[PDB]
Symmetry: C3
Subunit: 114 residues, 3 copies
């Protein structure tokens, strides 16, 4: 089986440094929790809310050693009324035998409300 | 193999009530037709065209008993001149044996226009 | 394993003709480079930057014979200040035994600047 591992985090300001810092924080955390090896990752999608503009979240993946070849692309999150502003979400697809109800999905910064 | 299943629907009003009703309806036809079990779903993506703002469509997934563990995320459909308006599309990635050409993709409401060759 | 394949290309103008020809040409190259046969494709996602509105790039998949049943959907790339303009990107997910570091990702047109190593 291959399974999806969700993640979410919010930034405080829209800067390159802030967006890449908190996105790398999110991914390190997912990796730790689920013991993900780069070569077991089919691909990753990262979305940002429409208020974030300074840099693509995906550039943070290349800060991780050994993740040079994991295919990643970003998309835009839909603008929802009463949604969490300045949120970065991730969908990581990994090869794994762990049950679905046991995957550790990581919700950080203001996204702890999830 | 793993194979993605596609579905699409539309709503007449941007409101929480209609979006969650129509997305629930769509997911249920796909699960039925494809005999999908929650535990075979790798993940699910939902998109909406940029005219829908009341609720994330994804919130309907939890009303489907046993689906509360399926990974979901929403994204924006691109704004194309003449594309179908207030349309929610789904890409469900599943582990199945059923061959590509027998995967039953589901279009409902005004979305019956989008791919008539899969009907 | 199943692995994702990334591609990217740019159009000169927002036209239905140039979007469909440059998307076709990218997909043809990914297929060529990775030996992709349609029944091995789990699904495919195409994004375009918020400056392309003429047609949905997924319509280009219709000109590849044998690909009628590949599940495709599109999404909007996020709008990053100073990002590469008029860009179409694909994330093709395929059944494959090729190693992750040997998958041929394809970057064409002005998109060649995006990942000079892939
Ligand atoms: O390779 C690309 O398509 C890029 O523009 C780079 C990149 C990345 O940094 O990895 C950033 C944004 C895109 O959505 C996908 C990936
Ligand atoms: O998990 C999150 O990050 C959410 O905000 C929840 C939720 C949902 O309502 O189901 C909404 C938006 C995301 O795109 C995916 C899922
Ligand atoms: O299948 C649909 O929902 C369509 O709208 C058709 C189509 C396509 O050309 O294949 C076009 C745009 C959508 O992003 C997804 C697919």
């Amino acid at each position: 089986m291959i399974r999806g591992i969700r993640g979410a985090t919010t930034v405080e300001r829209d800067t390159e440094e802030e967006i890449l810092q908190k996105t790398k924080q999110l991914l390190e955390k997912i990796i730790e929790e689920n013991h993900t090896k780069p070569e077991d990752v089919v691909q990753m999608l990262l979305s940002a809310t429409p208020d974030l503009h300074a840099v693509f979240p995906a550039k943070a993946v290349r800060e991780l050693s050994g993740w040079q070849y994991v295919p990643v692309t970003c998309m835009q999150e839909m603008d929802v009324t009463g949604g969490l502003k300045k949120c970065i979400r991730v969908m990581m697809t990994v090869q794994t035998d762990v049950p679905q109800d046991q995957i550790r999905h990581v919700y950080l910064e203001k996204a702890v409300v999830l």
